[PDB]
Amino acid sequence: EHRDMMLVVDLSGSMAEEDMKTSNGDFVDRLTAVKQVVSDFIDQRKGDRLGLVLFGDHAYLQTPLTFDRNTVREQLDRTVLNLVGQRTAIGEGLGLATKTFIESPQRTIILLSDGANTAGVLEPLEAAQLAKDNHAKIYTVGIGAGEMQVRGFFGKQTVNTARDLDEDTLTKIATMTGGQYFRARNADELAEIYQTIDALEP
Amino acid sequence: EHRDMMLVVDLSGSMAEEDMKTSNGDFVDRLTAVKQVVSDFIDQRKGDRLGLVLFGDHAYLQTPLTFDRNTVREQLDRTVLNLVGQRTAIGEGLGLATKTFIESNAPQRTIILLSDGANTAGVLEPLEAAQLAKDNHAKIYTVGIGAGEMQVRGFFGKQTVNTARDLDEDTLTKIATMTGGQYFRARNADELAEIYQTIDALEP
Ligand SMILES: [Mg+2]
Ligand SMILES: [Mg+2]
Structure with a gap:
C-alpha cells in the first residue's frame, strides 16, 4: 500500500546557525544537516507520494506531491537561506500542506x-x-x-x-x-x- | 502526471490454442503471444502504476499495483494455462480490477x-x-x-x-x-x- 507524505521544512534565517554536530565532530548549519538527512529519507520511501512545503514569513509549497522523488529531493537540495526572512509561519505551513492533500491518478x-x-x-x-x-x-x-x-x-x-x-x-x-x-x-x-x-x- | 492501469488477462483453457502467427511465419499459442506483447507493453510505460488480474472460472488478483514493472512482467511470465479451467469470468475480472482502484482511494x-x-x-x-x-x-x-x-x-x-x-x-x-x-x-x-x-x- 502507499501513503501521501508532506514535508514542511523551515527556511527562517535562524537556520543559518551552525548548530549541528556530526560524528567526526564538525559543525555545520541547520539547513545543511536537514538537506542531508531528509534527502536520505526521501530515497527511502519508494512507493509513496512526497511533496515539499517551505515556510517562514510567508509559506509556499515547492513540490506538489509527486511520486517522482528525485525531483522532490533535488528541489529541496537547491533551496537556499534567508530568502523567507526572520519570522516563521508554522500554522501557514501546516495548513498549506493539508490543503495540498486535497487539490491532488488517471x-x-x-x-x-x-x-x-x-x-x-x-x-x-x-x-x-x-x-x-x-x-x-x-x-x-x-x-x-x-x-x-x-x-x-x-x-x-x-x-x-x-x-x-x-x-x-x-x-x-x-x-x-x-x-x-x-x-x-x-x-x-x-x-x-x-x-x-x-x-x-x- | 501518473496513471493507474489494471491489466486483466484471460487464462481460460482456450488460450492454449495456437492460431497466433508470428513475424517469421510460424505459429504459437495465444498465451505465449500475450506474454510477449504485454510484457513489451509494460516496459514502454513510465511513471505509472500497473496491476495484474487473471480470470477463468473465477477471477483473482495477481499483482495489487506497483511502480516495479519487472514484478508484473515476471508474474505474467510464470503464468500457466488450465489452472482456471475452460470458462471465463469477464464481469468478475473487471469488478476485481475496479476494486483494485478503490484501495488506491485510501492513502494514509x-x-x-x-x-x-x-x-x-x-x-x-x-x-x-x-x-x-x-x-x-x-x-x-x-x-x-x-x-x-x-x-x-x-x-x-x-x-x-x-x-x-x-x-x-x-x-x-x-x-x-x-x-x-x-x-x-x-x-x-x-x-x-x-x-x-x-x-x-x-x-x-
Ligand atoms: Mg527561526
Ligand atoms: Mg475461453
Missing part, C-alpha cells in the same frame, strides 16, 4: 479475452458500469484468428478458430467506458493494438 | 514538520492548523531542531550559548499529540538522522 483497464462471458456472478456490462463510475476507461482486446480457409484433398473445408469470441459485448464495454475495442488475428496485429493503446494514454 | 496522510523556532508570525495559528490536519486524517510528526546550551570558544574567550532559545517545544508537542504523531528534538546531526529513521519505521 485510471485504465485493458481487458483481453478469447471468448464470451461463460461463467460469472456479475454480468459484464454491469461491471463496465461500475468501471465508469470509478472513472476507469476500458480498452478491450479480442484475440483469435477467426475464419481461415483450409485447402485440402476433396475440396474446401472451413475452420474457425475463435467463434466463442463475443465481440458485441466486448465492444459495448469499451464504448460505454469511452475506450476502443480491438481484434487481433495474429501476433503482429496484437503488438500494434497495444502499441496503439500506449499512445492513446500518454 | 502524514506530515513531517521541523522548525527551530516558535510560530512568531502567521495569520493561521499552529493549533488551529493542527486541528484541521486531524479533520483531514493527517498524522503530523514534529521535529524540534537546535543544540541548546553549548560551550564555545569566542575570540574574546570561552562562552555559553543556548542556540535554541526560540524553539517552542510544547506547541510542537501539542501539534503532534493532537494529531496522533510524535515530537522529536534533534540536538545534533546524528540525532536528526536517527529521528527520521524512526519516522520511517513508524510509517510502513
Whole structure:
C-alpha cells in the first residue's frame, strides 16, 4: 500500500546557525544537516507520494506531491537561506500542506479475452458500469484468428478458430467506458493494438 | 502526471490454442503471444502504476499495483494455462480490477514538520492548523531542531550559548499529540538522522 507524505521544512534565517554536530565532530548549519538527512529519507520511501512545503514569513509549497522523488529531493537540495526572512509561519505551513492533500491518478483497464462471458456472478456490462463510475476507461482486446480457409484433398473445408469470441459485448464495454475495442488475428496485429493503446494514454 | 492501469488477462483453457502467427511465419499459442506483447507493453510505460488480474472460472488478483514493472512482467511470465479451467469470468475480472482502484482511494496522510523556532508570525495559528490536519486524517510528526546550551570558544574567550532559545517545544508537542504523531528534538546531526529513521519505521 502507499501513503501521501508532506514535508514542511523551515527556511527562517535562524537556520543559518551552525548548530549541528556530526560524528567526526564538525559543525555545520541547520539547513545543511536537514538537506542531508531528509534527502536520505526521501530515497527511502519508494512507493509513496512526497511533496515539499517551505515556510517562514510567508509559506509556499515547492513540490506538489509527486511520486517522482528525485525531483522532490533535488528541489529541496537547491533551496537556499534567508530568502523567507526572520519570522516563521508554522500554522501557514501546516495548513498549506493539508490543503495540498486535497487539490491532488488517471485510471485504465485493458481487458483481453478469447471468448464470451461463460461463467460469472456479475454480468459484464454491469461491471463496465461500475468501471465508469470509478472513472476507469476500458480498452478491450479480442484475440483469435477467426475464419481461415483450409485447402485440402476433396475440396474446401472451413475452420474457425475463435467463434466463442463475443465481440458485441466486448465492444459495448469499451464504448460505454469511452475506450476502443480491438481484434487481433495474429501476433503482429496484437503488438500494434497495444502499441496503439500506449499512445492513446500518454 | 501518473496513471493507474489494471491489466486483466484471460487464462481460460482456450488460450492454449495456437492460431497466433508470428513475424517469421510460424505459429504459437495465444498465451505465449500475450506474454510477449504485454510484457513489451509494460516496459514502454513510465511513471505509472500497473496491476495484474487473471480470470477463468473465477477471477483473482495477481499483482495489487506497483511502480516495479519487472514484478508484473515476471508474474505474467510464470503464468500457466488450465489452472482456471475452460470458462471465463469477464464481469468478475473487471469488478476485481475496479476494486483494485478503490484501495488506491485510501492513502494514509502524514506530515513531517521541523522548525527551530516558535510560530512568531502567521495569520493561521499552529493549533488551529493542527486541528484541521486531524479533520483531514493527517498524522503530523514534529521535529524540534537546535543544540541548546553549548560551550564555545569566542575570540574574546570561552562562552555559553543556548542556540535554541526560540524553539517552542510544547506547541510542537501539542501539534503532534493532537494529531496522533510524535515530537522529536534533534540536538545534533546524528540525532536528526536517527529521528527520521524512526519516522520511517513508524510509517510502513
Ligand atoms: Mg475461453
Ligand atoms: Mg527561526
